[PDB]
Design a protein around this ligand. Structure first.
Ligand SMILES: [Cl-]
Ligand SMILES: [Cl-]
Ligand SMILES: [Cl-]
Ligand code: NA
Length: 137
C-alpha cells in the first residue's frame, strides 16, 4: 500500500488526523522506533484493541498481557507512568475491565501528542513524504 499526498499532509494538521489513519500510525510508529519510544504507540494500540473485548474472562487475559508487556518491570521497556496512575492501574487489575488502563492510555496519548509528534512533523522523513511528485507534460 501507499498513502496519497493528501493523506500525508493531513497528518500535519492535527495529531488526531495522524492517529485516525491506518497509514499514519505506521509511519509514526516507524519514527517512534527510530526514537526508542515505539512502546508508547504499541501500548496505546493495545488499549484500543482491549476495548473491543466484551467477555470479562478475555478482558482479564488480554489486560494481564498488556500490563506485563508495557507497564511491569518484566517489560523490555515500560511506558512512563507517574505513581498516581500506576497505583490506579494496579488496583484496576484485580478485576480488569475495558477501562482498566484509561488513565495510563491518556497519559501516553498526551505524551506522544506533545513530545514526539512535534518532532515527527519536523523530521526529514515526514518532510520528504510531504513533497509532491513532478507533473510531466
Ligand atoms: Cl494537534
Ligand atoms: Cl507499581
Ligand atoms: Cl487516548
Ligand atoms: Na467488556
Amino acid at each position: 500500500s501507499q498513502p496519497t499526498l493528501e493523506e500525508i499532509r493531513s497528518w500535519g494538521k492535527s495529531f488526531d488526523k495522524l492517529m485516525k489513519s491506518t497509514a499514519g500510525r505506521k509511519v509514526f510508529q516507524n519514527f517512534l522506533r527510530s526514537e526508542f519510544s515505539e512502546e508508547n504507540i504499541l501500548f496505546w494500540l493495545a488499549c484500543e484493541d482491549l476495548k473491543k473485548e466484551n467477555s470479562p474472562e478475555l478482558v482479564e487475559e488480554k489486560a494481564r498481557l498488556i500490563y506485563e508487556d508495557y507497564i511491569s518491570i518484566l517489560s523490555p521497556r515500560e511506558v512512563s507512568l507517574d505513581s498516581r496512575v500506576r497505583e490506579i492501574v494496579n488496583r484496576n487489575m484485580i478485576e480488569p475491565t475495558t477501562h482498566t488502563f484509561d488513565e495510563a492510555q491518556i497519559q501516553i496519548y498526551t505524551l506522544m501528542h506533545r513530545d514526539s509528534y512535534p518532532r515527527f512533523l519536523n523530521s526529514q522523513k515526514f518532510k520528504t513524504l510531504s513533497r509532491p511528485a513532478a507533473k510531466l507534460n
